[PDB]
Symmetry: D3
């Protein structure tokens, strides 16, 4: 069972796109979204990883109640939203709290209702509709094994 720490940048329900500057650990308001949309899950990145975009690997965490920007959550992957946009790959690892028995029933991507996966997909397709040049070329959900292999690659990229 793979587990890691996720730093949550943006709580579920937010239109303010907070980001962590990785050099300093400070929270910054990147922008107020130009679309009438809100993050469908708590959103952030996986500590000690490094991705295609220059940043740590993005992460989505399912929670019963959202946290605050900058909060750490020990998490375990259950799938991943593979997306290629105009800038290349920017995949989003879907996770649940690690070590919490209320989430033991969610082990892989099939265990997450289709309604919630569809709404997450909808967010990332459309949230930058009113920012020119942005679009999604592909967007598919893939399973836990895919997520884990992708995490483990991003961890090696970070180390070396």
């Amino acid at each position: 069972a793979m587990q890691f720490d996720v730093t949550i940048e943006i709580p579920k329900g937010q239109r303010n796109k907070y980001e962590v500057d990785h050099e300093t650990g400070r929270v910054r308001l990147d922008r107020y979204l130009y679309t009438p949309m809100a993050y469908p899950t708590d959103y952030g990145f996986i500590e000690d990883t490094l991705g295609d975009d220059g940043d740590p690997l993005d992460a989505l965490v399912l929670l019963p109640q959202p946290v605050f920007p900058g909060v750490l959550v020990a998490a375990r992957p259950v799938g991943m939203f593979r997306m290629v946009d105009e800038h290349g790959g920017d995949d989003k690892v879907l996770c649940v709290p690690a070590g919490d028995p209320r989430w033991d029933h969610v082990q892989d991507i099939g265990d997450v209702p289709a309604f919630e996966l569809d709404a997450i997909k909808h967010f990332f397709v459309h949230y930058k509709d009113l920012e020119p040049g942005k679009f999604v070329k592909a967007a598919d959900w893939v399973d836990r094994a895919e997520a884990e292999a992708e995490v483990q690659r991003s961890v090696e990229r970070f180390k070396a």
Copy 2:
């Protein structure tokens, strides 16, 4: 020189994904549904009292506010434009309003006085909020001026009185 005004009942505060709706015989607030998309109402949303629109409900309204109100609250309002759209149940236009008698909104007199970014975000909401509801759609949506808005309010009042 003497500006039109009316009362708007706000059903849904800005930032809501719960789609509340007033029942028009009883005056009770009902939860229609939780939205299926990760979207939220871009303004306070409701209807004009004592009007009747071509979907059998009172005419839809959007009110620009400095801070949202609660479901069921009345706001005296004046029209500045309208969002024309057509969904599955046909035409369903939305009158854009500001608070009446409030000098902080006097710079807004017609649809061109509303920043385009806000007009586009409102439009984006209605175009997409039912994207994940089977058999639902919204097509042909665009913005028209205070004149067209007022003339349509006028009709809906006429429908109501009948």
Copy 3:
């Protein structure tokens, strides 16, 4: 498939105990709770019913997001919480939103996770612990059929 309107008096997360005056339809603050507890679900009653206690039949509604006091929700029962306290028998019907396919997987009491049922039970067992004269003798979950039986009894008593 039985369904009815529930008026929600108290949103999930509240320590203010709101009640609807049935003579008038106005929302009243009965009291601020004496214990550091909060309603674990949206809470209220079923319209046009009369419980064995003389008020409309109490209802709990599972929701993805809470509503406001006074709000109507079309609901369908999936179980019932049976309790005996100082004033005797008291039942609370557990419901989900009617006509919403996101809740079609919840058909009976066994479909609600145990953690959630235990938390609801724990609320009603303990929330009046610091009000003198109160107690709870027993508290048990029963299934949809027993829930539907009590809804019918309470409908028939309203008409009476």
Copy 4:
């Protein structure tokens, strides 16, 4: 011990000035305040009273947690903020929840800390600073006996 129902129009912390239209019982947004101020207590009026201004007698209720606009609270008077503004008298009866033992220590105006009375006075002196023509000619706190005599007068004005 005098007690009455107060309809709360404006929860503590609000800059939106809600009002009840007394002919219909509907909640209306009268205005967003022009000053950077917020109601220091839950604020409303006493049901079945009638005052100098044409409206029911205004009321302030001390609470551990604010309510929602339109909510009823059974209350008992502990004092009153006598104020004369440009429109004449518009006194505000200060109250606590009736029948709640957590408020038994507050029986008259001396029992309310000076810091809270000063902040309430400050609100009503300044909240209309940025609306022309408004000002306060006098503003003093008076005791429970004064409040009660003033309530009982406003109740007779209503009845007859």
Copy 5:
């Protein structure tokens, strides 16, 4: 008159149990509570202390309005909550804001109303009821001097 800085981890009203990682200063979500309960006061720890349990000495701070996780508050002790659970002795120091004249009337444990002390006690007695393996053996309020004695012990252990 003893005073110290308290880092608030958890605002009043929270069911999310946030903790500060003492190695790093980052805020972490330890867990969502298993009971329908919420922290009755802002909750955290005293800076540069070490409790008998190995973490900084826990602190509760009475406030007119909650703060955010990670926020420092200059505080002075007025009492202490002594508890024994499954892992043994655990003390929580009850405090008010230091240098604030609105709290000068609270000097010792007898100055905090009984309803509030009982609610705080009830939280710590019951909040872990649905976590298996937990229990509470005893829970008692002691006065300011015993609080100040434990603050000193814990300061001396930090320096050690």
Copy 6:
């Protein structure tokens, strides 16, 4: 043609009566006090990073936003005016800002582009928020333009670098 910008750390979100403040050696957020008046910060409030004002702290800033942020959050910002005031610890000016690089604020270039109602409410806050604190005051407060704002930012940066 090339506009000045800087980073503002927001200590207090709009609508707050809790007066939070960042410690300038550690970067920790502290609660200074709960305000004594029934007032709340009319905008998000904070300071400009890497500056030093004439009260020994970094230069105070106000940032106009569509939605508030949390205590400690950074916002890249550009100045549009300044609120000059003098309290008990003497001069303590406040630079008025909007988000930098955001076309929704491009119509705001100088202090005259900010509606007067918002400028007056900001002023009212600072004039009165310490009315009930013994021995505190705020006098001589008024609004000046982007030029005076930028030149003062410039100084405070110069002070800082020293």
